[PDB]
Amino acid sequence: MKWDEIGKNIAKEIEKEILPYFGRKDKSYVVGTSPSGDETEIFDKISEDIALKYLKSLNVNIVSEELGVIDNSSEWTVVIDPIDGSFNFINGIPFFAFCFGVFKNNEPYYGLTYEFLTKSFYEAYKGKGAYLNGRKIKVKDFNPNNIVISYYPSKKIDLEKLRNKVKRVRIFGAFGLEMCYVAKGTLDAVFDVRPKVRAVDIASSYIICKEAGALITDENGDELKFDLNATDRLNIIVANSKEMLDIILDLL
Template sequence: MNWNELGLKIAKEIEKDVMPYFGKKEGAKIVGYSPSGDTTELVDRISEDNVLKHLKPLNVNIVSEETGTIDNNSEWTVVIDPIDGSFNFTTGFPCFGFCFAVFKDNNPYYGLTYEFLTKNTYEAFAGKGAFLNGEKIKVKEYNEKEAVISYYSRKNLNLIGKVRRVRIMGAFGIEMAYVARGALDGIFDIRPYVRTTDIASSYIICKEAGAIITDENGDEFKFKFDLNATDRYNIIVANDEKLLNMILEEIK
């Protein structure tokens, strides 16, 4: 299976189907609820139906934000978030995309994160590096005075004065991809809120780009007992141990 070709094909079809709803109220119409209890909006349903149309005939396991888990007892599991940043999409904020990750025997195999508006395609096969539009990418060298991060926390953290910029864009998978390309130095969520579907594709991309990914204790980040759409995580992604240690110190 050419997972990269399939992932990009699905992304392009979703793009064609949902972009007419960008920034329009009708796209936010509630049509159901996800297994985690979140609302399913019209654009979520349209995009997920498109994904399932392609994946169901393959008899692979599927983990999707809106449907939950489809277990076909396959060695392959595909984890998808059809629209990462769906609230941004429906309100007209230009930060959202498609997340598509493939695991073999629960081990990371391939990740694709696609931005609809910019057409940027981030991807990585495990062990083969990370790429943006076919060009190899890596995290940028850490510079304390120039650091730019994004974070989500219920705590009142005093990070503004310790980095140059804080940017919070509301699409965690996309923001992780920005760390991989060097547009952000780090991102973390310690509410916890993010799920496997939010982070799986960009997790693979970030690892291949050289990012450090841990939990809130600084231990190597690991997905829980199985790949599912309901578990929520604390996760830190940083381009350097110095930044990681600064974040860990602040969140204690």
């Protein structure tokens, strides 16, 4: 069936066996340490684990946070984040999401991104635009006197500056779903010059975003290009416009 229907299913299953778990930070514990270095906790595992029960039978290429990479030598590669911003979930903060990115010959094909608590699907096919539960969505018409951002900078960003330029901070704790807060026009921007965010985190939204006007820009100014491993941290500046980028560029 369609990548679309394949992701929404996987989503709805994840959502099934783990939402009860939501916030219950006591029934969780570390189970392993992901290839990325990070510590893998159990509800992460049981999600990914629930995810490979579908992608395994499709013998497509695979890449996720916990598992790493399973190369079946295929045209296609399904990149998954069982939970985007685990923590938030384990600590009852209603900001996490399922990240599902499908790639054809390293080319953004389809992209799903599910926000459990809001019951919201962020899905976008390369070439066909971006939708929120079926409604077309694009970036926000920029405006200097109202910009609202998020960010996870380095020890080399004049905080006071940005805060003197930006009219509203809103840090959240799940890049992937934050990007989507850009595609649907709620934030002028979200970056991350602290090389921590990985492939898996942004992948699915990398797409979606782009189809709704995103300027996924790398540390310099260039179009953020990336790889498809479980490892490899990376910079990134999802902006809603060619000025909003700049501002980050000046701060940067």
